[PDB]
Design a protein around this ligand. Structure first.
Ligand SMILES: [Ca+2]
Length: 439
């Protein structure tokens, strides 16, 4: 077929941009820090469990929250030897502490008995509790969103939520039970990808990747949304051979494309490309947290890579930032090796409109450390603060399943300066093994 530049009304991750990221990502303003291991210890509260991808119960706008003189958190958490055992436990601390050991673990959020009591068709096939957000409601409640996926229906990722009825005490914090347990979204097909269309390619064999996870809860003018990791559906320009001919996914200029589109496909990977069709997405909710509108995705990684992960977004010092973590490993951009790993940033004047990379590449943070390294760190998450130009970068250290007395723990959070549309790792800011703040 011939050339077309169509941007579908939304922004995208041009490849051009993604092509400076091999030169620019060598500047240290943009580089996660070498951490010290003689420091890193594991989690008391957890108990030999591995613990990665985590979120903090936060407020309306971004900031961590005070649910009763208490800092709270939400991690994936598994039996190290089980690559299919995922579950959302709930660690939590006091609100004046920093120390890793300040983190009592409150137990698996959910009862095995739960998926059923729920009354959610899609929910009784759930076989793994993946990641999301956790707001904290104006009427003092705990509202959780997370990934409802199942390895039985081909890895269908679904949009799930629940309130976390729970009681607090001057010293501890237990979990009575949960309610308002329902699944919101499973993909709509024209705009995002539902597990049916991933099966039409054969499913996994096909080679293509299906993701619908990490709903970030936020709100602007009292409208409260969910922004996630996804894949372009079938109208918001979609994965295909066709795919590679739209100049919207190259950017820079025509004639640029003509080289790249050419290279390319003359690739060793025309394909890993045609199928890479990912996105950070949007949808609206009702105060009962039911889907209200499916909205246009906020961005697409069209051709670069089919799996943007751990999506974020929030207003800070007046403008809207938005993010994501992703594995260079799984992208098609020369000079971005399989050791590469990232968090990316886009900004806009308005939550829903139009996100131009930060740093001019939307590169904000790169990380390479060999996988065996004890200081590997994945999922870096940009936590907003009351004010200041810094936000706190969280992550989980050390890989799930590698060492045998070393376990998916919290790697030291740290700092990051952001102002305007430029960021910069703040030099020498390593805070505590999990600090969610600074105050
Ligand atoms: Ca895909």
């Amino acid at each position: 077929q011939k050339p077309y530049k169509e941007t579908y009304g939304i922004s995208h991750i041009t490849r051009h941009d993604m092509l400076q990221i091999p030169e620019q990502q060598k500047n240290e303003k943009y580089q996660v820090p070498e951490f010290d291991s003689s420091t890193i210890k594991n989690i008391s509260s957890a108990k030999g469990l591995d613990v990665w991808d985590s979120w903090p119960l936060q407020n309306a706008d971004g900031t961590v929250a005070n649910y009763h003189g208490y800092h709270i958190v939400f991690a994936l958490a598994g039996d190290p030897k089980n690559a299919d055992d995922t579950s959302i436990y709930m660690f939590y601390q006091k609100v004046g502490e920093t120390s890793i050991d300040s983190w009592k673990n409150a137990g698996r959020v959910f009862k095995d008995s739960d998926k059923f009591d729920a009354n959610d068709s899609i929910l009784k096939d759930q076989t793994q509790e993946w990641a999301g957000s956790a707001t904290f409601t104006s009427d003092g409640k705990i509202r959780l969103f997370y990934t409802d996926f199942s390895g039985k229906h081909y890895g269908k990722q679904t949009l799930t939520t629940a309130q976390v009825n729970v009681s607090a005490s001057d010293s501890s914090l237990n979990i009575n039970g949960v309610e308002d347990y329902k699944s919101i979204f499973d993909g709509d097909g024209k705009t995002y990808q539902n597990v049916q269309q991933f099966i039409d390619e054969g499913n996994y064999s096909s080679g293509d990747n299906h993701t619908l996870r990490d709903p970030h809860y936020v709100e602007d003018k009292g409208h409260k949304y969910l922004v996630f990791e996804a894949n372009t559906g079938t109208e918001d320009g979609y994965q295909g051979e066709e795919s590679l001919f739209n100049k919207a996914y190259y950017g820079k200029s025509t004639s640029f494309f003509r080289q790249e589109s050419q290279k390319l496909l003359q690739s060793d990977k025309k394909r890993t490309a045609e199928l890479a069709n990912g996105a950070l997405g949007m949808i609206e909710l009702n105060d009962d947290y039911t889907l209200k509108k499916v909205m246009k995705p906020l961005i697409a990684s069209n051709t670069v890579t089919d799996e943007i992960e751990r999506a974020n977004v929030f207003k800070m010092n007046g403008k809207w930032y938005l993010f994501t973590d992703s594995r260079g490993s799984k992208m098609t951009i020369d000079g971005i090796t399989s050791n590469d790993i990232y968090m990316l940033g886009y900004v806009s004047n308005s939550l829903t409109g139009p996100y131009k990379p930060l740093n001019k590449t939307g590169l904000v943070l790169k990380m390479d450390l060999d996988p065996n390294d004890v200081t590997f760190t994945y999922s870096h998450f940009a936590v907003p603060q009351a004010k200041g130009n810094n936000v706190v970068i969280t992550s989980y250290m050390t890989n799930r399943g590698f060492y045998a007395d070393k376990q998916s723990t919290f790697a030291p959070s740290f700092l990051l300066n952001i102002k305007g549309k430029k960021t910069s790792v703040v030099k020498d800011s390593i805070l505590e093994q999990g600090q969610l703040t600074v105050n």
